[PDB]
């Protein structure tokens, strides 16, 4: 059966500025089948107040989802997104890099 | 607003 790997992007809604509230996004796109585990992490721990978009898909039938939470960036706190899917042999962690 | 089996 067709399987397509999620393309995982972690980023903030607005340019990050320490002490200013913002939103942290983990966007997963291009995947198939739809069953997927996505967690946002703060200092390696699961964030609980996380929402996600309704399952939709692109012209090529592959699925996309946005996971998101309000956050206030600081100097020391490290953020990431952890994704597991049938195409990944282990859960994959993508770290937020604010200097891209 | 919305509008068959295969």
């Amino acid at each position: 059966m067709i399987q397509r790997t999620p393309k995982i992007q972690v980023y903030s809604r607005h340019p990050a500025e320490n002490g200013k509230s913002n939103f942290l996004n983990c966007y997963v796109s291009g995947f198939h089948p739809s069953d997927i585990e996505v967690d946002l992490l703060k200092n390696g721990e699961r964030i609980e107040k996380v929402e996600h978009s309704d399952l939709s898909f692109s012209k090529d039938w592959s699925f996309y989802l946005l996971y998101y939470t309000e956050f206030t960036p600081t100097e020391k706190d490290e953020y990431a997104c952890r994704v597991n899917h049938v195409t990944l042999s282990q859960p994959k962690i993508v770290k937020w890099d604010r200097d891209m | 607003x919305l509008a068959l089996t295969v």
Binding site: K7, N25, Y27, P33, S34, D54, S56 | X1, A3
Partner: protein, 275 residues
């Protein structure tokens, strides 16, 4: 400009763990406006855009009935598809369907669409004339024969040219502030050494709407398409989109490289430079 309305449906079997999970969403252009999820407590079609909230109870009641009926029909489809492909009871499979219409600048019907996939592959599609079908394999020919005998295309065509375009026009009027807007990308490029001999140049486009955009790198005017890392256009979460394109370049050569941004909100395509 041009506008589209699309409904997207996904049903996934989960044998011996309940009935199939069904999710439906509707969009105008790149803006979502409704959802239904079969696993959720409400069992209602729900608003997902501020401008659809004013629709009265007959809309919500009728759309909830229609979407539940779409769900039932995909439940039948999952059984039928497993039979057509001689697949076992146990494994999970996915049916997806999309339909909707495009209108031009005058908001008259332009094109109509109605397509199905099974397990991520094209299954059957209404062709551009709205009168005939493209079937992607032998199982989908069985469907084609049944849909031709049942005159499915004629019932679809009437929907796509009539009701679809009427409701799209209505939404464009009621949600005009959101839907008939263009937000031009705020663009810049960033520069970061990866070593003492190379640097990543990343071309950014932020806060734009609609999502369609083109970002390209040139080196002395020549396209660098094989050397470019282009990410998928992504939602900011506030109704706008973002995208970037990157190349890794020898340090010292930055001024040969230019980023080029095309978007319907820009009065002219932009060229960004390192000098």
């Amino acid at each position: 400009g041009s506008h589209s309305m699309r409904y997207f449906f996904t049903s996934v079997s989960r044998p011996g763990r309940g009935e199939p999970r069904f999710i439906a969403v509707g969009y105008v252009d790149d803006t979502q406006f409704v959802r239904f999820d079969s696993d959720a407590a409400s069992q209602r079609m729900e608003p997902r855009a501020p401008w659809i909230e004013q629709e009265g109870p007959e809309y919500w009641d009728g759309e909830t009935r229609k979407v539940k009926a779409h769900s039932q029909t995909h439940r039948v489809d999952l059984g039928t598809l497993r039979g057509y492909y001689n697949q076992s009871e146990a494994g999970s499979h996915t049916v997806q369907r999309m339909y909707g219409c495009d209108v031009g600048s005058d908001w008259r019907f332009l094109r109509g669409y109605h397509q199905y996939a099974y397990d991520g592959k094209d299954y059957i599609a209404l062709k551009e004339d709205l009168r005939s079908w493209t079937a992607a394999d032998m199982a989908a020919q069985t469907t084609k024969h049944k849909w031709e005998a049942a005159h499915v295309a004629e019932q679809l065509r009437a929907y796509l040219e009539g009701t679809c375009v009427e409701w799209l026009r209505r939404y464009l009027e009621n949600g005009k502030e959101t839907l008939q807007r263009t937000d031009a990308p705020k663009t810049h490029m960033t520069h970061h050494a990866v070593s003492d001999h190379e640097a990543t140049l990343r071309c950014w486009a932020l806060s734009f709407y609609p999502a369609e955009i083109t970002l390209t790198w040139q080196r002395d005017g020549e396209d660098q398409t094989q050397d470019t890392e282009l990410v998928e256009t992504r939602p900011a979460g506030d109704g706008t989109f973002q995208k970037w394109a990157a190349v890794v370049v020898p340090s010292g050569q930055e001024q040969r490289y230019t980023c080029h941004v095309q978007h319907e909100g820009l009065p002219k395509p932009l060229t960004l430079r390192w000098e």
